[PDB]
Design an enzyme around this catalytic site. Structure first.
Site, PDB file in Angstrom:
ATOM      1  N   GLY A  41      57.019-104.467 -50.908  1.00 36.37           N
ATOM      2  CA  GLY A  41      57.784-104.842 -49.726  1.00 36.37           C
ATOM      3  C   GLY A  41      56.902-105.102 -48.515  1.00 36.37           C
ATOM      4  O   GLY A  41      55.774-104.605 -48.450  1.00 36.37           O
ATOM      5  N   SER A  42      57.425-105.891 -47.583  1.00 39.30           N
ATOM      6  CA  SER A  42      56.782-106.236 -46.307  1.00 39.30           C
ATOM      7  C   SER A  42      57.843-106.675 -45.304  1.00 39.30           C
ATOM      8  O   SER A  42      58.865-107.249 -45.676  1.00 39.30           O
ATOM      9  CB  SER A  42      55.727-107.348 -46.478  1.00 39.30           C
ATOM     10  OG  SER A  42      56.253-108.514 -47.099  1.00 39.30           O
ATOM     11  N   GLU A  79      58.836-106.220 -40.621  1.00 36.58           N
ATOM     12  CA  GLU A  79      58.429-105.621 -39.353  1.00 36.58           C
ATOM     13  C   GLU A  79      58.191-104.105 -39.519  1.00 36.58           C
ATOM     14  O   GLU A  79      57.432-103.509 -38.771  1.00 36.58           O
ATOM     15  CB  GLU A  79      59.468-105.927 -38.271  1.00 36.58           C
ATOM     16  CG  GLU A  79      59.390-107.383 -37.793  1.00 36.58           C
ATOM     17  CD  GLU A  79      60.700-107.914 -37.240  1.00 36.58           C
ATOM     18  OE1 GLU A  79      61.543-107.103 -36.806  1.00 36.58           O
ATOM     19  OE2 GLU A  79      60.886-109.151 -37.240  1.00 36.58           O
ATOM     20  N   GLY A 124      56.383-102.832 -41.794  1.00 35.27           N
ATOM     21  CA  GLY A 124      55.069-102.656 -42.405  1.00 35.27           C
ATOM     22  C   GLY A 124      55.011-103.130 -43.852  1.00 35.27           C
ATOM     23  O   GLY A 124      55.565-104.182 -44.179  1.00 35.27           O
ATOM     24  N   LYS A 147      55.239 -96.259 -48.127  1.00 37.83           N
ATOM     25  CA  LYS A 147      55.368 -97.152 -46.985  1.00 37.83           C
ATOM     26  C   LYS A 147      54.224 -96.905 -46.048  1.00 37.83           C
ATOM     27  O   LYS A 147      53.976 -95.785 -45.664  1.00 37.83           O
ATOM     28  CB  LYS A 147      56.690 -96.940 -46.214  1.00 37.83           C
ATOM     29  CG  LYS A 147      56.895 -98.012 -45.134  1.00 37.83           C
ATOM     30  CD  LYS A 147      58.289 -98.066 -44.593  1.00 37.83           C
ATOM     31  CE  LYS A 147      58.618 -96.893 -43.710  1.00 37.83           C
ATOM     32  NZ  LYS A 147      57.603 -96.649 -42.632  1.00 37.83           N
ATOM     33  N   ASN A 206      63.175 -94.328 -34.500  1.00 35.12           N
ATOM     34  CA  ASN A 206      63.467 -94.636 -35.888  1.00 35.12           C
ATOM     35  C   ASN A 206      62.631 -93.790 -36.848  1.00 35.12           C
ATOM     36  O   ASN A 206      63.153 -93.181 -37.757  1.00 35.12           O
ATOM     37  CB  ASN A 206      63.223 -96.121 -36.150  1.00 35.12           C
ATOM     38  CG  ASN A 206      63.607 -96.534 -37.548  1.00 35.12           C
ATOM     39  OD1 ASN A 206      62.843 -96.349 -38.495  1.00 35.12           O
ATOM     40  ND2 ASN A 206      64.796 -97.102 -37.688  1.00 35.12           N
ATOM     41  N   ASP A 211      72.917 -97.007 -41.834  1.00 37.73           N
ATOM     42  CA  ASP A 211      72.392 -98.330 -42.214  1.00 37.73           C
ATOM     43  C   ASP A 211      72.611 -98.624 -43.696  1.00 37.73           C
ATOM     44  O   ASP A 211      71.726 -99.124 -44.411  1.00 37.73           O
ATOM     45  CB  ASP A 211      70.891 -98.438 -41.856  1.00 37.73           C
ATOM     46  CG  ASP A 211      70.402 -99.874 -41.757  1.00 37.73           C
ATOM     47  OD1 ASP A 211      71.229-100.785 -41.543  1.00 37.73           O
ATOM     48  OD2 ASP A 211      69.165-100.082 -41.882  1.00 37.73           O
ATOM     49  N   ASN A 217      69.033-101.259 -48.765  1.00 33.90           N
ATOM     50  CA  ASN A 217      68.764 -99.834 -48.636  1.00 33.90           C
ATOM     51  C   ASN A 217      69.349 -99.009 -49.762  1.00 33.90           C
ATOM     52  O   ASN A 217      69.310 -97.791 -49.717  1.00 33.90           O
ATOM     53  CB  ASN A 217      69.300 -99.310 -47.282  1.00 33.90           C
ATOM     54  CG  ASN A 217      68.500 -99.850 -46.137  1.00 33.90           C
ATOM     55  OD1 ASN A 217      67.346-100.212 -46.306  1.00 33.90           O
ATOM     56  ND2 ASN A 217      69.096 -99.965 -45.003  1.00 33.90           N
ATOM     57  N   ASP A 266      65.955 -95.453 -47.132  1.00 34.46           N
ATOM     58  CA  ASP A 266      65.719 -96.011 -45.783  1.00 34.46           C
ATOM     59  C   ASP A 266      66.552 -95.194 -44.755  1.00 34.46           C
ATOM     60  O   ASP A 266      67.564 -95.603 -44.240  1.00 34.46           O
ATOM     61  CB  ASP A 266      65.977 -97.522 -45.775  1.00 34.46           C
ATOM     62  CG  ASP A 266      64.975 -98.304 -46.736  1.00 34.46           C
ATOM     63  OD1 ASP A 266      63.903 -97.745 -47.048  1.00 34.46           O
ATOM     64  OD2 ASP A 266      65.221 -99.465 -47.196  1.00 34.46           O
TER      65      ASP A 266
HETATM   66  C1  LIG Z   1      59.106 -96.243 -49.496  1.00 33.05           C
HETATM   67  C2  LIG Z   1      59.875 -97.055 -48.744  1.00 33.05           C
HETATM   68  C3  LIG Z   1      61.280 -97.356 -48.929  1.00 33.05           C
HETATM   69  N1  LIG Z   1      61.439 -97.593 -50.311  1.00 33.05           N
HETATM   70  C4  LIG Z   1      61.795 -96.588 -51.114  1.00 33.05           C
HETATM   71  O1  LIG Z   1      62.065 -95.429 -50.678  1.00 33.05           O
HETATM   72  C5  LIG Z   1      61.767 -97.107 -52.409  1.00 33.05           C
HETATM   73  C6  LIG Z   1      62.051 -96.625 -53.685  1.00 33.05           C
HETATM   74  N2  LIG Z   1      61.951 -97.475 -54.747  1.00 33.05           N
HETATM   75  C7  LIG Z   1      61.554 -98.759 -54.599  1.00 33.05           C
HETATM   76  N3  LIG Z   1      61.472 -99.596 -55.643  1.00 33.05           N
HETATM   77  C8  LIG Z   1      61.185-100.946 -55.608  1.00 33.05           C
HETATM   78  C9  LIG Z   1      61.381-101.837 -54.548  1.00 33.05           C
HETATM   79  C10 LIG Z   1      61.103-103.188 -54.653  1.00 33.05           C
HETATM   80  C11 LIG Z   1      60.597-103.687 -55.871  1.00 33.05           C
HETATM   81  N4  LIG Z   1      60.293-105.029 -56.008  1.00 33.05           N
HETATM   82  C12 LIG Z   1      59.205-105.417 -56.867  1.00 33.05           C
HETATM   83  C13 LIG Z   1      59.489-106.822 -57.431  1.00 33.05           C
HETATM   84  N5  LIG Z   1      59.664-107.808 -56.328  1.00 33.05           N
HETATM   85  C14 LIG Z   1      59.870-109.176 -56.884  1.00 33.05           C
HETATM   86  C15 LIG Z   1      60.785-107.400 -55.446  1.00 33.05           C
HETATM   87  C16 LIG Z   1      60.574-105.957 -54.924  1.00 33.05           C
HETATM   88  C17 LIG Z   1      60.417-102.790 -56.931  1.00 33.05           C
HETATM   89  C18 LIG Z   1      60.712-101.433 -56.836  1.00 33.05           C
HETATM   90  N6  LIG Z   1      61.256 -99.246 -53.378  1.00 33.05           N
HETATM   91  C19 LIG Z   1      61.362 -98.433 -52.296  1.00 33.05           C
HETATM   92  N7  LIG Z   1      61.089 -98.677 -51.011  1.00 33.05           N
HETATM   93  C20 LIG Z   1      60.915 -99.904 -50.515  1.00 33.05           C
HETATM   94  C21 LIG Z   1      60.367-101.030 -51.124  1.00 33.05           C
HETATM   95  C22 LIG Z   1      60.439-102.268 -50.468  1.00 33.05           C
HETATM   96  C23 LIG Z   1      61.153-102.457 -49.296  1.00 33.05           C
HETATM   97  C24 LIG Z   1      61.788-101.344 -48.740  1.00 33.05           C
HETATM   98  C25 LIG Z   1      62.556-101.464 -47.472  1.00 33.05           C
HETATM   99  C26 LIG Z   1      61.593-101.250 -46.294  1.00 33.05           C
HETATM  100  O2  LIG Z   1      63.271-102.722 -47.391  1.00 33.05           O
HETATM  101  N8  LIG Z   1      61.679-100.149 -49.407  1.00 33.05           N
END
Ligand SMILES: C=CCn1c(=O)c2cnc(Nc3ccc(N4CCN(C)CC4)cc3)nc2n1-c1cccc([C@@H](C)O)n1
Ligand SMILES: [Cl-]
Length: 261
Positions: free
Chosen positions: A15-16, A18, A20, A37, A51, A135, A140, A153
């Site tokens: 993820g990316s 504002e 981070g 994160k 926040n 939210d 989320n 989130d």
């Molecule tokens: C740690 C921070 C928050 N957060 C969790 O608590 C958390 C838990 N699980 C996961 N699993 C997860 C997420 C995305 C993917 N993808 C991989 C494949 N691509 C194509 C698409 C994205 C795979 C697995 N992601 C998480 N976080 C996370 C990731 C991203 C964006 C955001 C918010 C800021 O929008 N949060």
């Protein structure tokens, strides 16, 4: 020479924004995968700081639940803050919805009720600890894979009593919150969850403001593309009732007959 580098090996940016960057990481000592994160430390006295404070102290309070993304640790180094969470291997609900919209799959009636119940259980837990998420939306909600939905989130989380209200995404935001009425915040999470299920069910992009936005807060559900039962539809309608006291609590939600299944 950092804790991040020292304790974890970074596998993939997931993820990316504002907020981070978020990275899929392996922890060396235990071999488990975590979502970490990494963000620049917010300016003191800033919204970004408010926040970030809402999230550390939500963890302080909440502990562990099967429908909330587990929080493990948080620290600061360099000019950055790091938050180590559970990795949900199915990504977010938002991603899954995009993906359905791409390969033309869909969330069935049944799977929509499962989503509602599971996120409902998460909310019921947060609310019972005298907190509100503020939210709730697809981006989320996270998915583990046979499927678990988990609320993440927690940066908008605030107390039921004396709430520090940073308003969530306008698309999912209940009118009474916009009207600076914070006497039933839990019911705003309920409103948002309903619209979250409507998204999963295939609705068009929700209105951010203007006429169509207001029509929804009048209690009218956005148009769907599929066959939902009258009784599930009614349950979703009442979750977006103009009167937040008419909306079910999280506890009444997860005991509802339409979801018992
Ligand atoms: C740690 C921070 C928050 N957060 C969790 O608590 C958390 C838990 N699980 C996961 N699993 C997860 C997420 C995305 C993917 N993808 C991989 C494949 N691509 C194509 C698409 C994205 C795979 C697995 N992601 C998480 N976080 C996370 C990731 C991203 C964006 C955001 C918010 C800021 O929008 N949060
Ligand atoms: Cl309430």
């Amino acid at each position: 020479k950092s804790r991040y580098t020292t304790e974890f090996h970074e596998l993939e940016k997931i993820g990316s924004g504002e907020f981070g960057s978020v990275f899929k990481c392996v922890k060396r000592l235990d071999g488990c995968i975590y979502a970490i994160k990494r963000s620049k430390k917010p300016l003191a006295g800033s919204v970004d700081e408010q926040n970030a404070l809402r999230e550390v102290y939500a963890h302080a309070v909440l502990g562990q639940h099967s429908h909330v993304v587990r929080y493990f640790s948080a620290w600061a180094e360099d000019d950055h803050m790091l938050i180590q969470n559970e990795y949900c291997n199915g990504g977010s609900l938002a991603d899954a919805i995009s993906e359905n919209y791409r390969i033309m799959s869909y969330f069935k009636e049944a799977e929509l009720k499962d989503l509602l119940l599971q996120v409902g259980r998460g909310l019921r837990y947060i609310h019972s600890m005298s907190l509100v998420h503020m939210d709730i939306k697809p981006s989320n909600i996270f998915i583990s894979r046979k499927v678990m939905f988990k609320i993440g989130d927690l940066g908008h989380v605030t107390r039921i009593s004396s709430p520090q209200v940073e308003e969530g995404d306008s698309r999912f935001l209940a009118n009474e919150v916009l009207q600076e009425n914070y006497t039933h915040l839990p019911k705003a999470d309920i409103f948002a969850l309903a619209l979250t299920v409507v998204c999963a069910a295939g609705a068009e992009p929700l209105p951010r403001n203007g006429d169509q936005w207001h029509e929804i807060r009048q209690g009218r559900l956005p148009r769907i593309p599929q066959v939902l039962s009258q009784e599930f539809t009614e349950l979703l309608k009442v979750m977006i009732h103009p009167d937040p006291e008419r909306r079910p609590s999280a506890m009444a939600l997860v005991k509802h007959s339409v979801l018992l299944s």
